Amino acid sequence: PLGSMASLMEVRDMLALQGRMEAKQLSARLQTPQPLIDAMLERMEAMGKVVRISEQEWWALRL
Amino acid sequence: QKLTVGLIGNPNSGKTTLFNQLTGARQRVGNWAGVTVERKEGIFATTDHQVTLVDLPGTYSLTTITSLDEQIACHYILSGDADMLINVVDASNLERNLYLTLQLLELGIPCVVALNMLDIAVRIDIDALAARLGCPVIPLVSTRGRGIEALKIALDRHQANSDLELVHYPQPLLREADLLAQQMSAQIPPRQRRWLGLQMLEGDIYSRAYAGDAADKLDIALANLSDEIDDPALHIADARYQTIAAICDAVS
Ligand code: NI
Ligand code: NI
Ligand code: NI
Numbered sequence: 001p002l003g004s005m006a007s008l009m010e011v012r013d014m015l016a017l018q019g020r021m022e023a024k025q026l027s028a029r030l031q032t033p034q035p036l037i038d039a040m041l042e043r044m045e046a047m048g049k050v051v052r053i054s055e056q057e058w059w060a061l062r063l
Numbered sequence: 064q065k066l067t068v069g070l071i072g073n074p075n076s077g078k079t080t081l082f083n084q085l086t087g088a089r090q091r092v093g094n095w096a097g098v099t100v101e102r103k104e105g106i107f108a109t110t111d112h113q114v115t116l117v118d119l120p121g122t123y124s125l126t127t128i129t130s131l132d133e134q135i136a137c138h139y140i141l142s143g144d145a146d147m148l149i150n151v152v153d154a155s156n157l158e159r160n161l162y163l164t165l166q167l168l169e170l171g172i173p174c175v176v177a178l179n180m181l182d183i184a185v186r187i188d189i190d191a192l193a194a195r196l197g198c199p200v201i202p203l204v205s206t207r208g209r210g211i212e213a214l215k216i217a218l219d220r221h222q223a224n225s226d227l228e229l230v231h232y233p234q235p236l237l238r239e240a241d242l243l244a245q246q247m248s249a250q251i252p253p254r255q256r257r258w259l260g261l262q263m264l265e266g267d268i269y270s271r272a273y274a275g276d277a278a279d280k281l282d283i284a285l286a287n288l289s290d291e292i293d294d295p296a297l298h299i300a301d302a303r304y305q306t307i308a309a310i311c312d313a314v315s
Contacts, residue, residue: 002231005308008301009294036308039158043300047128047266 006032011040012061015050020060066112067144068218071136071167072151073160074121077179077205081151082118084208095135111219117145123159125166126262127269134269140172141255141273147173147221149214155184157315161307164196169229171254174198175217179205185315192314197225232302235291236264239284246277265299 001007010030015021023041027034041059044050048063072078082090086105095102103118119139120132127133139145150167152160167174174196178189181202193200199217203210232240240260247256262270263281271278288295 002302002305003309006304008297008304012294012297032308035156035158036304036311039162039307040304042123042159043162043304044297046123046126047296047300049297 006030006036006040008040008044011037011044012049015059015061020053020058023057023059026059064111064113065115066109066146066218067115067117069117069119069139069145069148070151071119071140071148071163072121073123073153073156073163076121076151076153076160078118078121078151080205081149081177081179081203082116084205084211085114085214086116095131095139098131098135100131100135109215109219114218116149122163124163125170126265126267128266137267137269138273140167140170145172147175147218149175149177149218151177151179153183154178154181154187157187157311158307161310162303165229165303165307168196168198168224170258171224171252173221173223175214175221176200177210177214178202182206188314192310195310195313197227197229230302230306232261233292233298235288236261236295236298236302239287239295240264242287243274243277243280243284246280247274248276261299264295266296 011026014026014030023037024034027037041050045052049061050059051062052059070078070082082105085107089106091104093102094100100120105116107114107116119136122132122136125133125137148167150164152164164176176196176198178200182204189200189202199221201210201214201217240257243260243263244256247259259270259274263274264284271281285295292298
């Protein structure tokens, strides 16, 4: 565990718990800068771990 | 006197513009052997070398989880055809751009980062970033096309990146990655075998194919971790974003 900050796992766990969240909510609740959060989400998305929702931005877990 | 340089970066990072600035009219278009994707190549001179510049398709990473880009770039990098790489990075989006950068530097191929959109960007301590990466970082203000000479100078001088341990991965993953690396042919350099091992655990479909005698050993690797790590791939990507965060914090 380098540092004391955002873990992609942390983002995963958080979403697993809340079901869905706005990226801004994640940035606040996890105390991690927004650009870092945005990049982490996209990475997990490309991996097919999280999914982006059109409704503005809802992020949740699965393919 | 000949030097082959690969040009790689995220999509929409100014890679094509930089490609034009370095080659001008000396460009030839074709295709990547065996596929339909275009392969563009160019020529130019430095004050030591006659450079052949191979454009690699825009890519966010070297991981292939239907885009051929990550695959083409990864396959080309692994082939050893290029003596060095020019990694084009958007200074206003280091959090996204450095994932590819880290993958290249970990792999160990000599690099020179061409730092772009420095005006569109936040303030970056270029020298600190160079220090954190272990390779040169040449600023470019493309709209004006300056720094091209500094970039050329770097190509003639840079020989090997600083030997740094850039990312901290969980011990179990390194353990298994080395187990995998021991099953790969000895024609693949040690450092690249370890890298391929981690790429396999990360879910890279290609690195797995490229690893031949280990492709079918990943299931037992995952089982060996079933005891310790829940999602291997998420841990490898997470580990890399840990240092991206550290670097971004230290230089921006
Ligand atoms: Ni030379
Ligand atoms: Ni090949
Ligand atoms: Ni863990």
